[PDB]
Design a protein around this motif. Structure first.
Motif, PDB file in Angstrom:
ATOM      1  N   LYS A 284       0.955  -1.370  -0.085  1.00 57.51           N
ATOM      2  CA  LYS A 284      -0.202   0.181   0.072  1.00 57.51           C
ATOM      3  C   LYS A 284       0.594   1.252   0.440  1.00 57.51           C
ATOM      4  O   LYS A 284       0.541   2.067  -0.787  1.00 57.51           O
ATOM      5  CB  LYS A 284      -0.511   0.196   1.356  1.00 57.51           C
ATOM      6  CG  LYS A 284      -2.324  -0.471   0.734  1.00 57.51           C
ATOM      7  N   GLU A 285       2.054   1.248   0.398  1.00 59.87           N
ATOM      8  CA  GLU A 285       2.670   2.049   1.024  1.00 59.87           C
ATOM      9  C   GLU A 285       3.915   2.277  -0.710  1.00 59.87           C
ATOM     10  O   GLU A 285       3.741   3.559  -1.228  1.00 59.87           O
ATOM     11  CB  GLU A 285       3.996   2.074   2.183  1.00 59.87           C
ATOM     12  CG  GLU A 285       4.852   2.990   2.326  1.00 59.87           C
ATOM     13  CD  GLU A 285       5.902   3.270   3.519  1.00 59.87           C
ATOM     14  OE1 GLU A 285       6.436   4.336   4.191  1.00 59.87           O
ATOM     15  OE2 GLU A 285       6.672   2.081   3.680  1.00 59.87           O
TER      16      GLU A 285
ATOM     17  N   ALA B 144       2.916   1.830  -3.169  1.00 66.69           N
ATOM     18  CA  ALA B 144       2.184   1.716  -4.022  1.00 66.69           C
ATOM     19  C   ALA B 144       1.071   3.730  -4.073  1.00 66.69           C
ATOM     20  O   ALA B 144       1.221   4.239  -4.815  1.00 66.69           O
ATOM     21  CB  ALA B 144       0.408   0.911  -3.900  1.00 66.69           C
ATOM     22  N   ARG B 145       1.176   3.986  -2.803  1.00 63.99           N
ATOM     23  CA  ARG B 145       0.628   5.170  -2.480  1.00 63.99           C
ATOM     24  C   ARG B 145       1.592   6.408  -3.490  1.00 63.99           C
ATOM     25  O   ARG B 145       1.780   6.977  -4.113  1.00 63.99           O
ATOM     26  CB  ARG B 145       0.796   5.403  -0.895  1.00 63.99           C
ATOM     27  CG  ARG B 145       0.209   6.507  -1.008  1.00 63.99           C
ATOM     28  CD  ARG B 145      -0.952   5.619   0.733  1.00 63.99           C
ATOM     29  N   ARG B 146       2.799   5.632  -3.167  1.00 64.17           N
ATOM     30  CA  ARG B 146       4.339   6.965  -3.838  1.00 64.17           C
ATOM     31  C   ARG B 146       4.778   6.440  -5.109  1.00 64.17           C
ATOM     32  O   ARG B 146       5.210   6.875  -5.868  1.00 64.17           O
ATOM     33  CB  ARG B 146       5.349   6.496  -2.618  1.00 64.17           C
ATOM     34  N   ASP B 147       4.343   4.938  -5.774  1.00 63.94           N
ATOM     35  CA  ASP B 147       4.462   5.061  -6.696  1.00 63.94           C
ATOM     36  C   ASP B 147       5.668   5.017  -7.043  1.00 63.94           C
ATOM     37  O   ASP B 147       6.361   5.805  -8.064  1.00 63.94           O
ATOM     38  CB  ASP B 147       3.624   5.096  -7.755  1.00 63.94           C
ATOM     39  CG  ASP B 147       4.068   5.420  -9.370  1.00 63.94           C
ATOM     40  OD1 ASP B 147       4.679   6.607 -10.112  1.00 63.94           O
ATOM     41  OD2 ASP B 147       3.953   4.779  -9.906  1.00 63.94           O
TER      42      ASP B 147
END
Ligand code: CL
Ligand code: CL
Length: 121
Positions: free
Chosen positions: A112-113, A115-118
Motif C-alpha cells: 500500500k505504501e 503504491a501510494r508513493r509509486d
C-alpha cells in the motif's frame, strides 16, 4: 520523465519481497522461514491433496528473477496465495497461523505504501 515506470515496478517488487522474506519479530527471529520452501514431497502428501495451488517464497523468488511480475499487484497476488494456503492448512490458534497474519499485514501495509508513493522507499 527521467525513469521508465516499467523498471521502477521491478524495484518496487523486489522491495516488497525483501520485506516479507526478512521480516523479524520482537526478539529478532525471521518470521518467514517456514515459507522459504514448499513442504516435503512426499512426507506431507496430505498437504498436496488439500492445497491445490501450492506456492512458497522459493517459487516467488524464481518468478521475480525472471521478471514474471509485471505489476506489484501480481506479486501481492502470489504472496496472498501463499498466506491463504497456510491459513487453510493450519488452525487459527497455531503459532504458524498467527505468524501468517502478521506477515500478511506487514506485506499489505508495505504494498500500500509502495503504491501510494509509486516509488521505492
Ligand atoms: Cl513511463
Ligand atoms: Cl521454522
Amino acid at each position: 520523465g527521467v525513469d521508465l515506470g516499467t523498471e521502477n515496478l521491478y524495484f518496487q517488487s523486489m522491495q516488497l519481497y525483501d520485506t516479507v522474506r526478512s521480516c523479524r519479530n520482537n526478539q529478532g527471529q525471521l518470521i518467514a522461514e517456514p515459507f522459504y520452501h514448499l513442504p516435503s514431497k512426499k512426507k506431507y502428501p496430505d498437504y498436496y491433496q488439500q492445497i491445490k495451488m501450492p506456492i512458497s517464497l522459493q517459487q516467488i523468488r524464481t518468478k521475480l528473477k525472471n521478471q514474471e511480475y509485471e505489476t506489484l499487484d501480481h506479486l501481492e497476488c502470489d504472496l496472498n496465495l501463499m498466506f491463504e494456503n497456510a491459513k487453510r492448512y493450519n488452525v487459527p490458534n497455531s503459532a504458524i497461523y498467527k505468524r501468517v497474519l502478521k506477515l500478511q499485514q506487514v506485506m499489505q501495509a508495505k504494498k500500500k505504501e509502495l503504491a501510494r508513493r509509486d516509488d521505492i522507499e
